[PDB]
Amino acid sequence: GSHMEQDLKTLPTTKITCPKCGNDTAYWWEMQTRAGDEPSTIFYKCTKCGHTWRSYE
């Protein structure tokens, strides 16, 4: 754990809320996995504290 590759200034942001700092917006992209919960999910990184969760589309 020494290098990294995160991005914020990029990725179109979407209007949402943050259950952590209470922000009112977050970044958003899709994240598909295998199959055992929700095919193709969208993570939303709040644009304030830097927290991200998942959607259902």
Instruction: Determine if 25 is a binding residue for Zn ion (CB under 5 A).
Output: no
Could you tell me the smallest distance in angstroms from the CB atom of residue 36 to Zn ion?
A: 28
Q: Rounded distance, CA 25 to CA 27, Å?
A: 7
φ, ψ dihedrals at 14, nearest 5°: -130, 155
Q: Is 38 a catalytic residue?
A: yes
Q: Which stretch binds Zn ion (CB under 5 A): 5-13, 29-37, 38-46?
A: 38-46
Structural Rg of the chain based on CA atoms: 12
Asked if 8 is part of the footprint of Zn ion (rule: CB under 5 A), the reply reads: no
Q: Which residues define the annotated binding site for Zn(2+)?
A: 18, 21, 46, 49
